[PDB]
Ligand binder design. Structure first.
Ligand SMILES: *CCOCCOCCS*
Ligand code: NA
Length: 312
DNA sequence: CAGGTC
DNA sequence: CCTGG
């Protein structure tokens, strides 16, 4: 079929393979699990979405990540285009090695990781990540997804249309800093989060030095990146850790939420000892993150993603 | 209220 | 202070 979303069977000549066993990556545990909100399984086991400013469809067999890209002449992805996929999934980070370390120092991980292999962190764009997770407060994956989708339709550049889906790039800072964006985003149902989207776009672009300020947090320390993000409206401790882990190359960031608290007590018998408060608070949440960073090591945020994936 | 942020 | 379950 020359129209529509492709499948491995329908258009074999347009797919290229990255050697990637299923223990290193499971799309079904990584793409709909609340890292990115913009991947869809348009046909069974085939995930479509925007990757490096282009639309891709991904599906995997036992040893191979099959990829196809929609650019005007149809042809399978080139080696350079496939490298964008490897960088997005950070395939040089070997889960077999990470899982071995986490199981070595943690018996509970070793037990529950066996049925949940292939859970890894995407390397997302800071802009998309920052604003997606600004929208994540008081909100669920289903509603976040719709909010992000309508956000991208209204302000993001049109790319291509496959079947009845028009794919849009994520909006620019300039777009999100434009006139009346908050009112517009309110019409799309973002509620109070609409103000924080507009306010954070204007803050970065008009007070912080622009896109280079955000992107160069990738080179700053984790502590520096977290501090800087927390200046932005809508970015609290938890949101900043999400962005640090998922977009700013801080694999030791541990977004502490009540879900992490339940896991900390149930499976690790953890309780706070730097403070005397017994439940969630700034002080105790910080300790909880430090606790998992010394238990799991510099990739604690990835280990958390494995555990989170078990529950869901 | 529980959850996050002001 | 907001908010959705
Ligand atoms: C409970 C949220 O507090 C108000 C700040 O909102 C930040 C996202 S717009
Ligand atoms: Na803030």
């Amino acid at each position: 079929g020359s129209e529509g979303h492709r499948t491995l069977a329908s258009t074999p000549a347009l797919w290229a393979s990255i050697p990637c066993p299923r223990s290193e990556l499971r799309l079904d545990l990584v793409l709909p699990s609340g890292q990115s909100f913009r991947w869809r399984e348009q046909s069974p086991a085939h995930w479509s979405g925007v990757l490096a400013d282009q639309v891709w469809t991904l599906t995997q067999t036992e040893e191979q990540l099959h990829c196809t890209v929609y650019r005007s002449q149809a042809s399978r992805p080139t080696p350079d285009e496939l490298e964008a996929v490897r960088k997005y999934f950070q395939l040089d980070v070997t889960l077999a090695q990470l899982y071995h370390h986490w199981g070595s120092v943690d018996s509970h991980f070793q037990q529950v990781a066996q049925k949940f292999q292939g859970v890894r962190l995407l390397r997302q764009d800071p802009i998309e990540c920052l604003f997606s997770f600004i929208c994540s407060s008081n909100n669920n994956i289903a509603r976040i997804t719709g909010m992000v989708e309508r956000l991208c339709q209204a302000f993001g550049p049109r790319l291509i249309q496959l079947d009845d889906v028009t794919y849009h790039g994520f909006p620019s800072l300039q777009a999100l800093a434009g006139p009346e964006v908050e009112a517009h985003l309110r019409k799309l149902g973002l509620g109070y989060r609409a103000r924080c989207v507009s306010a954070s776009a204007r803050a970065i672009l008009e007070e912080q030095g622009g896109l280079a300020w955000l992107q160069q947090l990738r080179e700053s320390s984790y502590e520096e990146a977290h501090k800087a993000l927390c200046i932005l409206p809508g970015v609290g401790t938890k949101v900043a850790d999400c962005i640090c882990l998922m977009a700013l190359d801080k694999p030791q960031a541990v977004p502490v939420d009540v879900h992490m608290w339940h896991i900390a007590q149930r499976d690790y018998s953890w309780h706070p000892t730097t403070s005397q408060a017994k439940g969630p608070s700034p002080q105790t949440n910080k300790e909880l993150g430090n606790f998992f960073r010394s238990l799991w090591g510099p990739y604690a945020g990835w280990a958390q993603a494995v555990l989170f994936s078990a529950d869901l």
